[PDB]
Amino acid sequence: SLEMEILKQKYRLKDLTFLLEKQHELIKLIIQKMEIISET
Amino acid sequence: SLEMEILKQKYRLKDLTFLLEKQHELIKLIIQKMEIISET
Amino acid sequence: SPLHFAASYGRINTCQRLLQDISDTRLLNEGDLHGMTPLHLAAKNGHDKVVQLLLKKGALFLSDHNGWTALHHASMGGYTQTMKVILDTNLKCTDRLDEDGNTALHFAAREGHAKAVALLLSHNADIVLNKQQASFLHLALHNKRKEVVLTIIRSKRWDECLKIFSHNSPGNKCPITEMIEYLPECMKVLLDFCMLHSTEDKSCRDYYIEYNFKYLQCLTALNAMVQNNRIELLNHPVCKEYLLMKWLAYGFRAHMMNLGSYCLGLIPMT
Amino acid sequence: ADVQKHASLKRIAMQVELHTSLEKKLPLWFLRKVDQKSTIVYP
Ligand SMILES: Cn1cnc2ncn(Cc3nc([C@@H]4CO[C@@H](c5ccc(F)cc5)C4)no3)c(=O)c21
């Protein structure tokens, strides 16, 4: 099977790295809109 | 192909773990600057 | 409570207010539910500014429920900037032992933090065995820490890191046999240093290469490469030259005298 | 085809096993005389 097993492994990792990059945009949106007082 | 099908999957996993390391350092930046009031 | 939270999460302005309010040192050294203290909480999560502020306020290098130091937590997490703050301020801290005989160097090595090993090893840390008679170099090898052991091999202290092991242990053997057993590509690196080239000029008739056998001797290393199936170490130039040296040293003359003793009955009969 | 599969290791294993057997039999003074901790070669 390995000639197509590792082919699906590629795609599960490719859509995992897409989700991790969508999430890195939201964490920057937090720091950008976050109210900073006291800890300046 | 598996002598290189697995090799690129190593590099894609390496750039994924690098993105997760960069993102873990922004979550800490939030807690460090966050206005904690009414929970302490 | 409030300072353990503020120190644990790097909240430097909350610390400055907590320590100006609590100007006595009794609050600055309080004991957590697991026996830690503000200086440990800051070093554990890696906040260089807070661990520095607590030391500028005169916190003390007290020890955990498990006897770990702030430097042991800093090393366990690989936070080399917090270690640099500690190693600058109180160099006498660097060799303290936990409840199990580990140092901070044994923690940096076990967890794979190569640049933290480099920092403690270059700050003259005491290389030693813990209660399981294991070196920091053993803890790196037994966990496959390739970048830690390349740092230890490339170190200005490598031959000191080699001589400090328990000769009486079957579990923590001669470090060269432990590299062949667990991390053979680090052994390829170590044997590349045994080839010296004397021209950089392969077209010159006078060109030579020298092989040094100091890691193959105390045939223990080659028996170990055979017993671990390390075929790409057997096929290395230093190993091919060590065996061809051993054959030209005595083994050819040993075989030719057995064959010559047999030929003295064989040939006269035909 | 199985001797020729394992051959590359087996040949070096045979040499290592020969020399270790001889070194266990020979006397320590002869080994200290005749062993040689480094060698130069001219390619
Ligand atoms: C260092 N060296 C450099 N030339 C050398 N010649 C001899 N010897 C001793 C010696 N040779 C051998 C034979 C070599 O081929 C082996 C073989 C090959 C493939 C297999 F599948 C099985 C067995 C067996 N057994 O012992 C040296 O040590 C030496």
Side-chain angles (χ1 to χ4, degrees), chain A, chain B, chain C residues 1-20 25 27-29 31-90 93-94 96-125 127-198 204 207-270, chain D residues 1-32 34-43:
Chain A
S1 62
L2 303 191
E3 194 171 330
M4 59 68 59
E5 200 88 59
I6 292 155
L7 186 148
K8 190 178 298 189
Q9 199 74 6
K10 190 202 309 292
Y11 283 107
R12 202 189 303 277
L13 197 70
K14 195 178 295 190
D15 206 35
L16 185 78
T17 199
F18 177 77
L19 183 61
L20 189 69
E21 186 59 89
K22 277 182 59 178
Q23 190 188 330
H24 190 217
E25 290 167 349
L26 293 174
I27 292 157
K28 292 173 69 185
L29 195 285
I30 293 163
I31 303 163
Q32 187 169 29
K33 298 305 187 191
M34 168 166 72
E35 186 177 14
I36 301 179
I37 297 182
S38 186
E39 310 318 275
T40 55
Chain B
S1 61
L2 303 192
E3 196 160 300
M4 58 69 60
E5 205 82 50
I6 288 158
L7 184 148
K8 193 183 296 182
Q9 189 73 338
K10 197 181 302 302
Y11 281 102
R12 185 164 33 258
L13 191 69
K14 201 180 297 184
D15 197 38
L16 179 79
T17 204
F18 176 77
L19 185 63
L20 191 70
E21 171 70 353
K22 284 191 67 166
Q23 185 183 312
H24 180 71
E25 237 55 52
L26 294 181
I27 300 301
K28 289 170 60 193
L29 195 285
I30 294 161
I31 304 164
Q32 189 164 35
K33 298 305 187 191
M34 172 164 69
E35 189 180 0
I36 302 180
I37 294 180
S38 191
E39 300 301 342
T40 49
Chain C
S1 177
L3 183 62
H4 301 321
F5 183 87
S8 185
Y9 293 105
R11 323 195 87 251
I12 185 66
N13 275 277
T14 302
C15 292
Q16 293 161 2
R17 287 150 189 69
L18 257 290
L19 285 325
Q20 283 174 103
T25 60
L27 186 277
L28 180 62
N29 298 176
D32 184 28
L33 181 63
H34 293 189
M36 295 193 296
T37 208
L39 189 70
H40 299 181
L41 277 314
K44 177 187 170 185
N45 286 355
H47 303 103
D48 51 12
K49 287 193 179 185
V50 176
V51 74
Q52 186 153 225
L53 184 283
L54 269 49
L55 289 173
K56 183 185 177 184
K57 289 287 188 281
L60 298 176
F61 291 94
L62 312 184
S63 56
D64 182 42
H65 172 75
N66 308 274
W68 294 32
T69 309
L71 182 59
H72 292 205
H73 297 94
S75 302
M76 177 80 186
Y79 297 112
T80 63
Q81 312 290 7
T82 67
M83 308 194 324
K84 187 167 55 181
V85 166
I86 296 166
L87 272 44
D88 288 345
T89 51
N90 281 89
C93 186
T94 318
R96 192 90 69 74
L97 298 166
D98 84 335
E99 80 161 45
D100 211 14
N102 292 65
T103 72
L105 184 67
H106 297 78
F107 286 114
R110 189 187 70 192
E111 300 304 330
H113 296 296
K115 307 308 176 186
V117 173
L119 189 61
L120 269 65
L121 191 64
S122 63
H123 272 266
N124 306 314
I127 298 160
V128 69
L129 304 182
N130 73 69
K131 289 184 180 182
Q132 300 189 300
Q133 297 190 358
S135 174
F136 86 119
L137 175 63
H138 293 136
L139 266 52
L141 293 165
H142 296 178
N143 292 280
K144 297 179 180 173
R145 304 304 189 195
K146 187 236 64 183
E147 199 91 335
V148 171
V149 304
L150 259 62
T151 295
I152 295 164
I153 284 162
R154 303 260 178 74
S155 186
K156 291 170 182 171
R157 302 182 64 186
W158 163 237
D159 313 87
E160 184 176 55
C161 302
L162 183 55
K163 281 176 167 62
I164 302 164
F165 80 101
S166 54
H167 292 279
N168 296 351
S169 182
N172 303 338
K173 307 181 300 300
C174 177
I176 318 298
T177 70
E178 298 289 332
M179 283 175 65
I180 294 156
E181 187 172 319
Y182 287 94
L183 275 180
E185 302 307 304
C186 308
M187 184 61 178
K188 180 188 73 192
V189 171
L190 188 64
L191 291 172
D192 288 348
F193 291 118
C194 301
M195 301 175 67
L196 307 185
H197 299 265
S198 193
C204 298
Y207 166 55
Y208 82 82
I209 61 190
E210 186 179 75
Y211 300 92
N212 188 326
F213 305 134
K214 85 170 195 167
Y215 303 134
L216 291 318
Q217 64 151 77
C218 166
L219 310 188
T220 58
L222 266 71
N223 273 259
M225 294 170 192
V226 168
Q227 288 168 18
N228 290 289
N229 300 306
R230 303 311 188 193
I231 195 171
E232 299 295 328
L233 276 58
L234 263 50
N235 283 278
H236 193 65
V238 194
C239 297
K240 293 193 176 190
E241 290 289 330
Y242 181 63
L243 278 172
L244 180 59
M245 177 278 293
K246 201 73 66 152
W247 179 249
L248 299 173
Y250 63 82
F252 176 76
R253 192 184 186 182
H255 189 226
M256 287 303 301
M257 186 158 287
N258 188 29
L259 178 142
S261 82
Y262 187 82
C263 289
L264 197 61
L266 172 70
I267 294 173
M269 189 173 288
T270 76
Chain D
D2 298 326
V3 174
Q4 285 198 306
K5 185 177 176 180
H6 304 157
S8 181
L9 170 58
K10 181 59 179 181
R11 93 171 203 96
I12 314 297
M14 285 270 294
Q15 295 163 354
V16 173
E17 187 58 37
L18 176 140
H19 289 298
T20 191
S21 186
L22 276 159
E23 199 159 347
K24 290 164 185 179
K25 277 174 282 187
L26 291 163
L28 177 63
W29 72 264
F30 175 86
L31 303 172
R32 283 181 171 170
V34 176
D35 201 299
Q36 193 155 36
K37 306 306 190 74
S38 177
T39 58
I40 287 168
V41 173
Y42 293 82

